[PDB]
């Protein structure tokens, strides 16, 4: 029921604005793209020290309200607002596991919710909407931090408005 907000105290807009995800435990890490296995194009989302400020995201809910709540099912996407590229998804992939990846399709109701955690916010993945959720944490590999399912060990974010 609580509103998701930015660092300036303003409620997160619905698709309208992009926001940087600034981790509290990785001050020098921004959202970025990397390859996992034998992929030609980078489709996995990582926290990369070689990328500050990281890639900003947009929060989209089909509800025609201008703010984002904890209880809304959300799509998270890179790039422009109405585009279908850069949409986040969870895909079983070795050796990381339940890795956050990008696709070019946009479901009507996304599998993500933004929930309060510690001093900030966590991205919670629900395989389907009614279910129990899985916190997205970090899998340490290749001198970068792959965002992935790590229930009990959430990755904590601040949400910084793109300006």
């Amino acid at each position: 029921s609580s509103v998701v907000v930015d660092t300036n105290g303003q409620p997160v807009s619905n698709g309208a604005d992009a926001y940087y995800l600034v981790p509290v435990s990785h001050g020098h890490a921004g959202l970025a793209l990397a390859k996992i296995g034998n992929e030609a194009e980078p489709r996995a989302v990582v926290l990369d020290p070689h990328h500050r400020p990281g890639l900003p995201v947009r929060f989209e809910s089909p509800l025609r309200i201008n703010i984002i709540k904890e209880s809304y099912f959300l799509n998270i996407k890179f790039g422009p607002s109405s585009s279908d590229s850069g949409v986040w998804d969870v895909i079983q992939q070795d050796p990381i596991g339940l890795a956050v990846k990008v696709t070019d399709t946009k479901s009507l109701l996304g599998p993500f919710k933004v929930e309060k955690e510690g001093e900030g916010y966590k991205i919670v993945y629900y395989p389907e909407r009614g279910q129990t959720g899985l916190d997205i944490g970090l899998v340490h590999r290749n001198d970068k931090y792959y965002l992935a399912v790590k229930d009990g060990e959430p990755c904590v974010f601040k949400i910084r408005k793109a300006t």
């Binding site: 509800l63 309200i65 703010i67 109405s82």
Partner: protein, 223 residues
């Protein structure tokens, strides 16, 4: 409002805005002390603003009345968007005048093709964002339920109806939620949700007010 026109100051006397320092949802004034809106517009400490045409200027005929009770429909489902309706009781009765009038509850549900009026301060563009200062209006017809279920598979409940234009270009959008859908002088719909705004084969979906008329009366009577 995408593809609409400027209403005018006195033209939508039942339109209200839900505020907590900023505008986030629309609403409908149904009597002197009660406003209806969407369930997902629920917020703590809602302040209700009546009689606005320009939201960014204190035009003078406005009244800011704080909510006394914000009652979401008890069957509201945060996962399925069904039962998307909320009641807001004002702490004091609103004064009716040229810019402030109540809209009456519907007697029956409207049938496909009925011409309806949708209003709100939402986005005017299907891609990107642009928020107007003055209230915007749009005429749009109710669509048949068979085409409605085809547009949004598995998501259309018995308490919802589609409205708009299958071509696109004319639709409600983010920021209109909770606002009125008026047909024949009756509050028939509440703007709820849709896939993007004004996209082809992605019409607006609106809560079917007529299913809740007894509950509205029971809730107003009980409180």
């Amino acid at each position: 409002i995408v593809g609409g026109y400027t209403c005018g100051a006195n033209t939508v006397p039942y339109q209200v805005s839900l505020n907590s320092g900023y505008h986030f949802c629309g609403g409908s004034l149904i009597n002197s002390q009660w406003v209806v809106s969407a369930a997902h517009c629920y917020k703590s400490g809602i302040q209700v603003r009546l009689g606005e045409d320009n939201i960014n200027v204190v035009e003078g005929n406005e009244q800011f009345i704080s909510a006394s009770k914000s009652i979401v429909h008890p069957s509201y489902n945060s996962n399925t968007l069904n039962n998307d309706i909320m009641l807001i009781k004002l702490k004091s009765a609103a004064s009716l005048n040229s810019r402030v009038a109540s809209i009456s509850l519907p007697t029956s549900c409207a049938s496909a093709g009925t011409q309806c009026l949708i209003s709100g301060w939402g986005n005017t563009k299907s891609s990107g964002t642009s928020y107007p200062d003055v209230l915007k209006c749009l005429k749009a017809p109710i669509l048949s339920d068979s085409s409605c279920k085809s547009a949004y598979p598995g998501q259309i409940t018995s308490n919802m109806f589609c409205a708009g234009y299958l071509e696109g270009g004319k639709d409600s959008c983010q920021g209109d939620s909770g606002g009125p859908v008026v047909c024949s002088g009756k509050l028939q719909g509440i703007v709820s949700w849709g896939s993007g705004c004004a996209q082809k084969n992605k019409p607006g979906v609106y809560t079917k007010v007529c299913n809740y008329v007894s509950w509205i009366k029971q809730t107003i009577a009980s409180n």
